[PDB]
């Protein structure tokens, strides 16, 4: 269920929440999706009360199943930006969408890219009732609440603290990355191998991790190991 | 008047093809998902039924390099040395791949 | 090791990640005899690239 807090509903749309430094207090703010709204106010320059009775429990993902969603203690890349553990950017004009999810009434979503992560928003009133690039104006935005209609997320990604490693270890795994996939050479303009001409669009999925370099380490042959340990942050 | 001609070349021994078969180069690979007890709410009694074509534990939907690899519960370590903060046996699930590299 | 047979130089999957150090991948299977015990057997490999 809820983590620590069932954040209240605020009727006045103009809700000014400044920066906060308390570690435990800010969690309910994320449960209120205050960082999700702040991305809209910082980048879409639109102030809107997000997740009214929505919270984390009602955020929907393109895959229908996520066991890790049930585990509310898992940090998400979007929520890692309130703590600043990673970076997100504006939807570049060079980016083309993956036709996986159905974009009806949508405003903001995420994309795990091979270099980083990127946010996608557009005009208030202008709702994405279609999977197209644009968003047509709609009156569904008149109310202050869209119950995760404006919010949808991609992939069941885990995020946790990281201890740095020399890049030569990252290099040999990068060399190891090419060994297990001779069938690809280019990823979204970022070169992965060197071969003949290739067809640009392909819906393609492989497990991956981040370690803190420009490239992602992908795997189809790894194995996981879960351990519980005492850490002051996990309190 | 018209005519038709037939040429003959060789005498040889071959036979009919009843049915055609293909065999790739199978190679063993595997992954294990290491899950501690009370994390993921492991079944304290392993259920004999398994969703081996989905793997709800790990990415219920994905194309795999596998010819439907079977999964089995296993009795992992338990305790602080195992890092599961519990004496209960660990909860490890597994998958088989049958693949051809080249 | 008096017993050793070289690898096969036809199965080659090399990507030139680094100019100085060529990166190569190979798979397959091996067929070598066995010794009367008490030694150390070897297995040599080649490449279309000349030096290494």
């Amino acid at each position: 269920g809820p983590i620590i807090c069932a954040g209240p509903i605020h009727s006045n749309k103009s809700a000014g929440i400044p920066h906060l430094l308390g570690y435990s207090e800010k969690i309910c703010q994320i449960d209120r999706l205050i960082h999700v709204s702040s991305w809209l106010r910082n980048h879409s320059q639109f102030q809107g009360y997000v997740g009214q009775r929505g919270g984390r429990s009602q955020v929907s993902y393109y895959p229908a199943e996520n066991s890790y969603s049930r585990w509310s203690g898992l940090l998400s890349p979007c929520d890692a930006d309130w703590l600043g553990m990673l970076v997100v950017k504006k939807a570049k004009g060079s980016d083309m969408i993956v036709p996986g999810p159905s974009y009806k009434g949508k405003v903001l979503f995420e994309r795990p890219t091979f270099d980083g992560y990127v946010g996608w928003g557009c005009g208030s009133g202008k709702s994405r009732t279609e999977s197209g690039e644009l968003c047509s104006s709609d009156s569904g935005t008149s109310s202050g609440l869209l119950p995760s209609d404006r919010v949808l997320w991609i992939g069941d990604v885990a995020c946790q603290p990281m201890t740095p490693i020399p890049e030569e270890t990252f290099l040999e795994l990068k060399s190891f990355s090419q060994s297990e996939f001779p069938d690809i050479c280019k990823i979204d303009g970022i070169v992965f191998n060197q071969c003949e001409g290739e067809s640009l669009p392909q819906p393609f999925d492989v497990a991956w991790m981040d370690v803190g370099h420009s490239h992602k380490i992908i795997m189809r042959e790894h194995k996981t190991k879960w351990v519980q340990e005492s850490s002051s942050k996990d309190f | 008047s018209k005519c038709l001609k037939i040429k003959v070349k060789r005498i040889n021994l071959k036979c009919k093809k009843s049915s055609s078969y293909f065999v790739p180069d199978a190679r063993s690979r595997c992954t294990s998902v290491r899950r501690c007890r009370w994390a993921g709410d492991c079944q304290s009694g392993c259920p004999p039924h398994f969703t081996s074509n989905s793997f709800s534990d790990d990415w219920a939907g994905k194309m795999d390099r596998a010819g439907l690899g079977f999964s089995g519960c296993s009795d992992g370590c338990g305790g602080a040395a195992c890092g599961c903060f519990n004496a209960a046996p660990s909860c490890i699930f597994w998958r088989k791949w049958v693949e051809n590299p080249h | 090791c008096d017993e050793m047979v070289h690898a096969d130089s036809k199965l080659v999957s090399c990507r030139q990640g680094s100019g100085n150090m060529k990166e190569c991948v190979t798979t397959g299977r091996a067929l070598l005899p066995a010794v009367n015990p008490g030694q150390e057997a070897c297995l040599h490999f080649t490449a279309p690239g000349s030096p290494d």
Binding site: - | - | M21, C24, T27, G28, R29
Partner: peptide, 28 residues
């Protein structure tokens, strides 16, 4: 006949002498 199976490997890429010296003895 000890034999092996080969997976997808990771195998990657001078001045010298004659450097010879003495011999030991056994045949057959």
């Amino acid at each position: 006949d000890i034999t092996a199976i080969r997976g997808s490997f990771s195998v990657n890429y001078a001045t010298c002498t004659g450097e010879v010296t003495n011999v030991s003895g056994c045949y057959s």
